Design a binder for this molecule. Structure first.
Ligand SMILES: Nc1nc2c(ncn2[C@@H]2O[C@H](COP(=O)(O)OP(=O)(O)OP(O)(O)=S)[C@@H](O)[C@H]2O)c(=O)[nH]1
Ligand SMILES: [Mg+2]
Length: 164
């Protein structure tokens, strides 16, 4: 089984930690705002994903840099029902990917919380996150629901599929 270091970032409350343990434990666990980081190795399609879950609160976003070096794939998780902060998510996203340290990272977007009445569809997120305006770079917007599991594995698959 080949290995892949995945860094997972997003605004506070996007659902990063939930994705982590749904993937790993298969259950929907109780979480708290992440202060340091979490780490689980998830093995799917003969590949060992090394997934790092980092707190998203504003004061601790400067810590994200510490984790860049090494990362082969970025998973950026978005609350799709959080219309007030999508612009903010755009910023942070672009900061990540432009840092020389992530020049060669594959970019998986989790458009999360799709179960919620205002799902702000996948195509929306894609345009609203200024992804369309990005070529010469491997990116995909996966719809998901972290509580149920929908899209999660499908995202892992894309990272498997899109890693040379
Ligand atoms: N309805 C719904 N709720 C979700 C979904 N994903 C996560 N949540 C809920 O949102 C809450 C916060 O998610 P969490 O996983 O802790 O965010 P986080 O990205 O880790 O946030 P932080 O630690 O960076 S501050 C949890 O109570 C969780 O159950 C989803 O797809 N749908
Ligand atoms: Mg967290």
């Amino acid at each position: 089984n080949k290995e892949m270091r995945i860094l997972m970032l997003g605004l506070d409350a996007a659902g990063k930690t939930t994705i982590l343990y749904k993937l790993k434990l298969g259950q929907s666990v109780t979480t708290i705002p992440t202060v340091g980081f979490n780490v689980e190795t998830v093995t799917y399609k003969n590949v060992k994903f090394n997934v790092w879950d980092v707190g998203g609160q504003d004061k601790i976003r400067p810590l994200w840099r510490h984790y860049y070096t090494g990362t082969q794939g970025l998973i950026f998780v978005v609350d799709c029902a959080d219309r007030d902060r999508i612009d903010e998510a755009r910023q942070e996203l672009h900061r990540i990917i432009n840092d020389r340290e992530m020049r060669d990272a594959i970019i998986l977007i989790f458009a999360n919380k799709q179960d919620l009445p205002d799902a702000m569809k996948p195509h929306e997120i894609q345009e609203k996150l200024g992804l369309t305006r990005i070529r010469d770079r491997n990116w995909y917007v996966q719809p998901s629901c972290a509580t149920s599991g929908d899209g999660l594995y499908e995202g892992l698959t894309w990272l498997t599929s899109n890693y040379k």
